[PDB]
């Protein structure tokens, strides 16, 4: 058994100002096994309503998964995603940036 | 062939009642 | 993966597909056909052994077969009262011979 | 001669030996089995037919059997196959009339010589 | 749409080798089926063939597809492959909610090989139950005619085959009978080409005694009753033997 | 396998027919019902999918035949107002799966009359062979012939000691008409069993022609003097036959005459022996 | 309960069925009604009897219900199974037959012995 | 329309 | 151009608890049209696009019989493969089946395709010319002869060629309002200077179908294969696609760097410049 | 063709044991009536 | 080739099984595991016997195999069939038999005889 280790990507659905609806990304792909853990923080703690796609693989048997949640961008706020996998030693988490 | 039990019965039959008449001639002659 | 036995009419056929090697028993007799051998009757009581090969998944294995009948047309029930009766009809009459023999001697 | 009412005891003949069995359609198991009421036995799964031996023996009686359900009707077997049955035709009597007339001059004979 | 089947009809000998095929125009072929049908029972599922080129062989029927049209083969046909044997095409659909495109069929017949021939009619005795006069025609040469009765009262049924696995012996044979006095079977295949030295058999009878002792068999019965025989002899020879003597030493 | 049920179907004119088309081994998706003339060749009639309506052909009057496909495995054809026209042969083939072949099922004969006073059961008769066949060439034709019955639906089959027989039987694949021209006809049926010259002619042997018969069922309005015509067996029976010749029954008959007669000579012999033996007794006695 | 009686002579064999008493009977074969006023004389039915006048073995053979008037033949509680041979002139060899031949062919030989006996004394 | 034919496994 | 019709399913043991885990998907080019999850409360096969809600009871009755007939399947696939391997049963494994086809710009079939996978390696292909197939290790070997054995390459290639290619076009005739769309790309570039000399200069790409889109940098016409970062294209959540290209560069020379996209939807490759 | 104990070797067989009976016996018979 | 041992006493059938003689065998009959169950009183199994009693000839003849412990029973290649006529108290005896008792009993008979004579005579 071959494993292979997530790469992650947290973004937003449209261009980002603050005041108005959008929705936050947390993109997962190229990893093996099939069992993940993702959670998508605000100022560090947990949002409890958030959705995710059906898993699929690409072409070399790699799985990889979407979660997404609205959200009203703000200055003084911050956003990030957690992701844990059994080639994981330690949960890696991933902030939000604008300009990317 | 022949296994008709009938010509057997005559013959023994025959057979039978000569050997006891000479039996009877032969055993009164030697007595 | 038997050798099949097919019970005729009155006749007993042993089936294979291919020629039916004679091992021991009756010799039989073909029929034309060389997968077929005929033992001949059953009241015969024929009795053998006999080796063929297969032409199915069976490829490359033998296979032997023992045809045992016992029909026993020579068989006759006797029932112990019957032949001890018989017996001692049989020393009565004996008895009763030696007996007139001896008053004859006188 | 029918399944529903309780008519389950059939005969089973015409075999290659003179032999002559009894079937009934009870599907139990063991099936137990009564001539004029006495028990006479019982089958397992392996035998379905009961024995009665070679019919010139002339089997007759009643019989019945059981299983699950209640005691089977009555079934009444009769034969009689001549197995003695003689024919009188003219060689039979001529020959029993030779024998007779033979034997009874052998023995005239013979009690005659032995007149005193 | 197109699919075409022929021959409509065959006629074989057995042991020859012969292959029926099936043409179709169709832009789709799903599938492709082979059944075979006899004359009153549910057709016999053969074959499926689902692309061009491939092959299928079964114990001896062989079954190909190309992109025009598919072959049956036969080889070494026997008499009990005789049946009608069908050809259906699938079409492509987004949904197979479209029906089969059936064959009309192929009649096959095959005939067997009858060695040599022997042709005989032969009146049947009655069976004191019925009033009818049956005779029976056998062992003909396997290629002849056997037409119907211009009588209106005569009835003649077809030639069929029989096979004796116990002789390994194949015949062809038919039956005529009627109900009608003046019915002496010399005339009831006139209607037919009878072929030539077709034997007529006497009207006495004959016997063969040794073949009659051929089938002879015996039981327990018997055997006992020639032992009581014996026995019965046995003892009547020892008391005649012993009266003797006796009427010996009185006299 | 795909079974129906009835196999054999007859009906007066004016009643409702129900055949049903029992799929086993899989879960069939597809059942479709098929209709075949006599010496014609298969039309389809209709098609049930799935769980939705069936799709009916331009010749099925809707009106005339139902379809129900209940379950998964039971699709069911319902002939509502039967007529002599509808007498047929209706088959059912099913498949799984839209890409994989269909199987059929054994067809179902229907037979409808206007009238039950038209159904008759066959009547069987056994004729045995010529000597002049078995003097020329060793061999035994018994013929069994059924004759005057109506509808066409038997089944014949050869019984010897008991067993059904298979090799040496040959029997006409259809039924044929009496009067091929007029309606109503009855039917005949031949069959020919060949044996070899000694089995024939061993008096030990039993041989019987059995014609099974599909008629009236059980509860059918009979308002007729004759019997009625249900489904029934009807036989015919022969003994191995020896006409000329030393057979069993001719040894065992001679036996049975010489076991009475020694027993009669040997009690007159014995009766002999004791008056001979009480004379010698006096006749010494008295010395 | 009480069997059917059978009796033969010859080759007539006449059935009785003590059952159902004073009500008529009606018979079957092989569940065919026979005995009726059929155009058959070697047929025939009375109160309480069935009379089968020259029976033929493969054919009259088998199966023997008695039921009265009115009633289903499946509800007759009694099957018989017949299955005879009949010939015209055949008799019957038993132990009884046997027995009384074996008396009877004994008692002339002696009174035909006692009476040559006397004979040959009184002449010699 | 996923295929619709004879499932075989591995 | 082109299209394609896929579908991936996907089966995971779990040694303890419950039957394996099954999940199903079905994919129009680049578009989810249809789902099925083993672990969902329906138990059907469930719609995921507008224009397939159209189809008719007997169609989803059809799907959700057969994609369960996949489950059953690959769980005895699972069972025997877990023989083949010799592993223990306390163990997690997974396998994994793809199969689908193409269309040219005709609408006729080009190509199909067919794959199994054990444990994320290659276990069983079938070739590109659709009649042999191709086994990697000596354990699929065995699963190579009984398929051929039994013509399996056939029945497949049957559907592939066929009833694959005549669902593909009715579902892009049913859907041709979005299936045939084509989005260009809304490219813009922005700056960042990182900390006093160097800078970044990334030019995005957004909201563009379908997803096969290019992105490169230039420096007076030198392909700067090295020195530049780009990201794997991600979802935007509603059908569209992103994606974005930075390179660092000394400042005062940004003038100098110039980005080229091109995509699917634009009539010409375009070239984007600072200000 | 199976007699079993039906053979007439049997009948023939007594039949035969009587017949030497006889005619030995009658040989001595006519051998004392023609020596004296 | 060992051939099978068969024994037939009254309704008693007995089957001895050759080329096994240090391994324990299970028999097989028409494809079903026979004997060997410490039931079926008619049934019984033993070393290398097996016994069968009440033997019926329409119900129990057919195939026979004797094969092995251990070992998948269809690789055997030496099968039996058995169709055999069984009777109460019936026992099979040839001519020759009933030829030599006869002749023995009449020797018999005739050797008393004389010596009765020679006995009597002086006397
Ligand atoms: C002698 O040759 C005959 C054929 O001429 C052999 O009979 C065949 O035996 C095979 C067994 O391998 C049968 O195949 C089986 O068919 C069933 C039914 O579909 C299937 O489920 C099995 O998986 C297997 O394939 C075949 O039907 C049978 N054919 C006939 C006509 O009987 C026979 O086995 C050969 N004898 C020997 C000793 O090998
Ligand atoms: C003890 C001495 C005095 C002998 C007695 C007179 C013999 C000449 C007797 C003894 C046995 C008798 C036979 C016993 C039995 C038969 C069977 C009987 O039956 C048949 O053989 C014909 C019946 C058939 O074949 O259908 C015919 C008369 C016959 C030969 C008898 C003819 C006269 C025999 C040979
Ligand atoms: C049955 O098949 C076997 C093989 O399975 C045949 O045995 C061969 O006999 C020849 C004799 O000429 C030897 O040369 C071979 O070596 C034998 N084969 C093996 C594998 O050892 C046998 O001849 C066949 N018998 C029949 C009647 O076909
Ligand atoms: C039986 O009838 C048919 C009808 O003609 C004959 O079969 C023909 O045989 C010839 C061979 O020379 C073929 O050319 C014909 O095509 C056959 N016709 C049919 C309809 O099959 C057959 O010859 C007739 N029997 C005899 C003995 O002549
Ligand atoms: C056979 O009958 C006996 C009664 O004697 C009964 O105990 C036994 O259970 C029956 N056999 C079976 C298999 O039930
Ligand atoms: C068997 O008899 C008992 C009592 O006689 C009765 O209660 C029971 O119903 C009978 N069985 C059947 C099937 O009628
Ligand atoms: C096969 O069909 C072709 C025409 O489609 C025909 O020419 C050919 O004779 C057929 N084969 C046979 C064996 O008849
Ligand atoms: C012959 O038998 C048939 C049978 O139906 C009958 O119709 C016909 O009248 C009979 N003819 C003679 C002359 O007996
Ligand atoms: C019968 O056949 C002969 C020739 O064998 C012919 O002369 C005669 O006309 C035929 N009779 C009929 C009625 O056809
Ligand atoms: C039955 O009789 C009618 C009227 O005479 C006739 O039209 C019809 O053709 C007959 N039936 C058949 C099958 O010939």
Same mark, same amino acid.
């Given at each position: ?15 980002? #100002? ?18 993940? #853990? ?12 958030? #959705? ?16 997404? @949640?609205?959200?009203?961008? @703000? #200055? ?10 059994? @080639? ?13 | ?31 | ?106 | ?116 | ?24 125009? +169709? ?35 062989? %079954? ?55 042709? %005989? ?62 019915? %002496?079977? %010399? ?21 063969? +005694? ?42 | ?93 099913? *498949? ?95 069959? *020919? ?93 008295? *010395? | ?124 | ?10 | $151009? ?20 099954? &999940? ?28 397939? !809600? ?8 059809? !799907? ?14 699972? $069972? ?43 276990? &069983? ?51 041709? !309002? ?34 096969? &889109? ?62």
């Amino acid at each position: 058994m071959i494993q292979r280790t997530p790469k992650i990507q947290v973004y937003s659905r449209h261009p980002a #100002e603050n005041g108005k609806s959008n929705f936050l990304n947390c993109y997962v792909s190229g990893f093996h096994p099939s069992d993940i #853990e993702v959670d998508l923080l605000k100022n560090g703690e947990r949002i409890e309503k958030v #959705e995710h796609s059906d898993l699929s693989f690409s072409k070399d048997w790699s799985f990889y998964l979407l979660y997404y @949640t609205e959200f009203t961008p @703000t #200055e003084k706020d911050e956003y990030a995603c957690r992701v844990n996998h059994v @080639t994981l030693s330690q949960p890696k988490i991933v902030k939000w940036d604008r300009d990317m | 062939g022949l296994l008709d039990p009938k010509l057997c019965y005559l013959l023994d039959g025959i057979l039978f009642i000569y050997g006891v008449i000479l039996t009877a001639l032969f055993l009164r002659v030697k007595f | 993966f038997k050798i099949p036995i097919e019970e005729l009419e009155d006749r007993v056929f042993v089936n294979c597909n291919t020629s039916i090697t004679w091992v021991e028993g009756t010799v039989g007799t073909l029929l034309s056909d060389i997968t077929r051998l005929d033992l001949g009757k059953r009241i015969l009581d024929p009795r053998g052994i006999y080796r063929c090969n297969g032409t199915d998944i069976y490829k490359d294995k033998e296979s032997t077969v023992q045809v045992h009948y016992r029909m026993c047309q020579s068989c006759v029930e006797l029932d112990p009262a019957t032949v001890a009766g018989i017996i001692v009809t049989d020393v009565i009459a004996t008895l009763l011979l030696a007996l007139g023999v001896f008053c004859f001697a006188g | 001669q029918s399944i529903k009412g309780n008519h389950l005891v059939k005969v089973y003949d015409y075999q290659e030996d003179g032999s002559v069995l009894l079937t009934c359609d009870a599907e139990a198991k063991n099936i137990t089995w009564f001539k004029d009421g006495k028990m006479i036995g019982f089958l397992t799964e392996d035998k379905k037919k009961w024995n009665l031996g070679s019919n010139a023996k002339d089997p007759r009686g009643m019989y019945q059997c059981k299983g699950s359900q209640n005691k089977s009707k009555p079934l009444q077997v009769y034969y009689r196959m001549c197995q003695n049955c003689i024919e009188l035709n003219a060689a039979t009597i001529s020959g029993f009339l030779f024998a007779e007339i033979v034997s009874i001059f052998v023995l005239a004979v013979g009690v005659y010589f032995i007149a005193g | 749409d197109q699919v075409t089947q022929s021959p409509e009809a065959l006629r074989l000998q057995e042991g020859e080798s012969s292959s029926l095929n099936c043409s179709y125009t +169709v832009s789709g072929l799903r599938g492709l089926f082979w059944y075979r049908q006899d004359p009153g029972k549910g057709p016999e599922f053969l074959f499926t063939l689902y692309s061009a080129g491939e092959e299928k062989e079964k114990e001896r029927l062989k %079954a190909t597809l190309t992109k025009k049209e598919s072959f049956l083969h036969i080889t070494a046909p026997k008499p009990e492959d005789s049946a009608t044997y069908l050809c259906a095409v699938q079409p492509l659909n987004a949904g197979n909610n479209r029906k089969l495109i059936w064959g009309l069929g192929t009649s096959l017949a095959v005939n067997p090989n009858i060695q040599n021939p022997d042709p %005989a009619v032969y009146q049947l005795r009655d069976s004191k139950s019925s009033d009818k006069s049956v005779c029976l025609f056998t062992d003909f040469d396997s290629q002849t005619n056997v037409s119907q009765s211009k009588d209106s009262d005569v009835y003649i049924t077809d030639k069929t085959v029989l096979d004796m696995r116990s002789m390994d012996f194949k015949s062809n044979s038919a039956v005529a009978w009627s109900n009608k006095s003046d019915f %002496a079977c %010399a005339n009831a295949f006139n209607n037919s080409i009878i072929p030539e030295d077709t034997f007529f058999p006497s009207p006495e009878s004959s016997c063969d +005694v040794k073949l009659v002792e051929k089938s002879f068999e015996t039981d327990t019965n018997l055997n006992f009753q020639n032992l009581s025989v014996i026995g019965f002899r046995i003892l009547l020879l020892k008391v005649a033997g012993f009266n003797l003597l006796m009427t010996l030493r009185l006299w | 396998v795909v079974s129906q049920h009835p196999s054999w179907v007859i009906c007066k004119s004016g009643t409702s027919v129900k055949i049903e088309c029992r799929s086993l081994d899989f879960q069939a998706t597809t059942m479709f019902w098929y209709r075949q003339f006599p010496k014609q060749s298969l039309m389809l009639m209709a098609t049930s999918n799935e769980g939705s309506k069936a799709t009916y052909e331009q010749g099925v009057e809707k009106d005339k035949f139902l379809i129900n496909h209940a379950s998964l495995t039971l699709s069911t054809l319902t002939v509502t107002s039967a007529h002599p026209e509808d007498s047929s042969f209706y088959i059912c083939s099913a *498949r799984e799966w839209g890409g994989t072949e269909a199987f059929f099922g054994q067809g179902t004969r229907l037979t409808v009359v206007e009238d039950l006073n038209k159904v008759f059961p066959p009547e069987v008769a056994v004729f045995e062979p010529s000597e002049a066949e078995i003097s020329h060439t060793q061999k035994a034709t018994l013929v069994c012939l059924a004759t005057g019955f109506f509808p066409d639906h038997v089944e014949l089959s050869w019984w010897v000691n008991g067993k059904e027989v298979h090799s040496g039987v040959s029997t006409d694949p259809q039924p044929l008409k009496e009067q091929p021209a007029l309606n109503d006809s009855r039917y005949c049926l031949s069959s *020919r069993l060949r044996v070899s010259a000694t089995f024939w002619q061993n008096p030990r042997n039993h041989f019987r022609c059995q014609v099974q018969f599909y008629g009236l069922s059980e509860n059918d309005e009979w308002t007729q003097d004759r019997a009625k015509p249900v489904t029934q067996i009807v036989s015919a029976e022969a003994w191995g036959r020896a006409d000329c010749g030393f057979t069993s029954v001719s040894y065992q008959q001679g036996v049975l005459s010489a076991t009475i007669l020694y027993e009669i000579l040997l009690g007159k012999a014995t009766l002999y022996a004791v008056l001979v033996s009480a004379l010698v007794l006096m006749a010494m006695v008295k *010395r | 309960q009480t069997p059917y009686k059978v009796s033969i002579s010859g080759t007539t064999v006449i059935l009785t069925c003590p059952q159902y008493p004073g009500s008529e009977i009606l018979w079957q074969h092989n569940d065919k009604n026979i005995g009726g006023d059929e155009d058959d004389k070697n047929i025939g039915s009375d109160e309480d009897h069935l009379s089968l006048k020259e029976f033929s073995e493969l054919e009259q053979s088998g199966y023997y219900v008695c039921y009265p008037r009115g009633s289903k033949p499946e509800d007759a509680n009694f099957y018989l199974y017949l299955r005879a041979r009949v010939c015209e002139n055949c008799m019957e060899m038993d132990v009884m037959s046997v027995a009384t031949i074996v008396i009877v062919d004994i008692c002339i030989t002696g009174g035909l012995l006692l009476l040559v006996y006397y004979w040959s004394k009184n002449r010699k | 329309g996923v295929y619709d034919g004879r499932e075989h496994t591995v | $151009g082109s299209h394609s019709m896929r579908y991936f399913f996907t089966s995971v043991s779990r040694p303890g608890r419950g039957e394996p885990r099954f &999940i199903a998907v079905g994919y129009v080019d680049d578009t989810q049209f249809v789902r099925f999850d083993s672990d969902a409360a329906s138990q059907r096969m469930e719609p995921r696009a507008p224009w397939i !809600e159209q189809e008719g009871p007997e169609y989803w009755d059809g !799907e959700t019989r057969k994609v369960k007939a996949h489950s059953q399947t690959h769980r005895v696939d699972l $069972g025997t493969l877990r023989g083949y391997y010799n592993q223990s049963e306390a163990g997690s494994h997974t396998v994994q089946r793809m199969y689908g086809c193409d269309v040219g710009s005709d609408w006729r079939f080009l190509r199909g395709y067919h794959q199994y996978a054990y444990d994320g390696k290659d276990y &069983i292909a079938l070739k590109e010319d659709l009649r042999s197939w191709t086994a990697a290790d000596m354990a699929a070997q065995t699963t190579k002869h009984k398929w051929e054995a039994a013509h399996v390459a056939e029945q497949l290639r049957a559907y592939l060629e066929g009833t694959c290619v005549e669902w593909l076009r009715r579902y892009l005739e049913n859907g041709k !309002e979005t299936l045939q769309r084509t989005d260009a790309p809304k490219t813009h570039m922005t700056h960042h200077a990182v900390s006093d000399h160097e800078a970044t200069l990334r030019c995005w790409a957004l909201s563009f179908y379908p997803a096969e &889109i290019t992105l490169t940098w230039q420096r007076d016409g030198e392909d700067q294969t090295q020195d530049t970062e780009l990201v794997e294209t991600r979802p935007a959540g509603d059908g569209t696609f992103q994606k974005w290209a930075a390179v660092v560069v000394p400042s005062g020379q940004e003038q100098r760097y110039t980005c080229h996209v091109q995509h699917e939807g634009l009539p010409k490759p375009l070239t984007l410049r600072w200000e």
